[PDB]
Design a protein around this ligand. Structure first.
Ligand code: ANP
Ligand code: CA
Ligand code: CA
Ligand code: CA
Ligand code: MG
Ligand code: NA
Length: 311
């Protein structure tokens, strides 16, 4: 931190105590939030922000540099060949991927499978030239369980069939049971603390994204209140994905009129990739990608078995 203009040993202390230990967090901060820190004046705040941006080289980029930025995105395999294909390789870091669908479609299964897959080095696809082995080493997951359906048994079973050690997945997966939207949002905001404590959080799961909000703000005469809170939550998730180069996955429920993911416009805008998971015959499932910034809408057929997600 003292590498930053105006920042001395004392100011560096104030910053770390305030939660600002990374150059990127400072470069992307507002004069206000920094001035909210005791002895940090407006000029000092503005000076260190500009300095952090410079050190992080956050200016105009063009040509090959645009490809290099895109190469810092790594992807997590879903264990499904067709789904990985529709995803353009796998679940993308630096983005929010939403899986919506009717009950029993497999949303929670995909979340569990992702926590397991994170522990298989060969399931993280990346360009070694842009992403070092160290950046994805000792990856850990955060599972914000809003519906109380996290199941250690399922983790162990999926791990076993993948040839991975179940206990290792549990040891490297943080689960936070949220009973309402306030806890849900706070847990998400506190993931930064886990990072600061030395945990390489590379996967963040929110299951479910909207169930709490939908139950707390029912009156359609309070919908604005809900969309605002939902918007702040989504903003935290997106920034989280970018600053810590991790994949963020969220599940969403559906309502009639055929079906549409709930959460309104804000969720639609904030989500990067949007899927509708449908049920086929027996254990067959169809993941339909209907929105993304660079991939064509497409369908991926897969199955949910005792082994987890397969095909
Ligand atoms: N141990 C298992 N072995 C085989 N199939 C399983 C196992 N556990 C769950 N399933 C399948 O997973 C389906 C449920 O997946 P799940 O991801 O929980 O649905 P969901 O979309 O999240 N539904 P909901 O929480 O109501 O929105 C079941 O109905 C089972 O067919
Ligand atoms: Ca992003
Ligand atoms: Ca259910
Ligand atoms: Ca079933
Ligand atoms: Mg579920
Ligand atoms: Na096994």
């Amino acid at each position: 931190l003292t590498d930053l203009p105006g920042v001395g040993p004392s100011t560096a202390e104030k910053l770390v105590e305030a939660g600002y230990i990374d150059f990127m967090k400072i470069a992307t901060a507002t004069v206000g939030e920094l001035t909210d820190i005791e002895g940090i004046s407006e000029k000092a705040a503005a000076k260190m922000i500009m300095g952090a941006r410079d050190l992080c080289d956050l200016g105009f980029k063009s040509g090959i540099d645009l490809l290099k930025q895109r190469s810092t995105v790594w992807k997590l395999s879903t264990s499904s060949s067709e789904l990985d294909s529709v995803l353009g390789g796998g679940l993308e870091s630096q983005s929010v991927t939403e899986f919506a669908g009717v009950f029993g479609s497999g949303k929670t299964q995909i979340m569990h499978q992702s926590c397991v897959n994170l522990q298989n080095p060969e399931f993280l696809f990346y360009d070694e030239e842009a992403v070092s082995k160290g950046e994805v080493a000792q990856p850990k997951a955060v599972y914000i369980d809003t519906e109380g359906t996290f199941r250690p048994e399922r983790i162990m079973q999926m791990a076993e069939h993948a040839g991975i050690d179940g206990q290792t997945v549990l040891d490297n997966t943080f689960v936070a049971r949220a009973y309402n939207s306030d806890m849900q949002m706070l847990f998400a905001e506190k993931i930064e603390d886990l990072i600061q404590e030395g945990n390489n959080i590379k996967l963040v799961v929110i299951d479910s994204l909207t169930s709490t909000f939908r139950n707390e703000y029912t009156g359609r005469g309070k919908l604005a209140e809900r969309q605002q809170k939902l918007g702040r939550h989504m903003a935290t998730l997106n920034k989280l994905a970018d600053l810590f180069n991790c994949v963020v996955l969220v599940t969403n429920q559906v309502s009639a009129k055929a079906e549409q993911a709930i959460g309104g416009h804000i969720v639609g805008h904030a989500a990067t990739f949007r899927f509708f998971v449908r049920k086929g015959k027996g254990d067959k499932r169809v993941a339909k990608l209907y929105d993304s910034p660079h991939l064509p809408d497409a369908e991926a057929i897969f199955r949910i078995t005792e082994k987890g997600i397969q095909d």
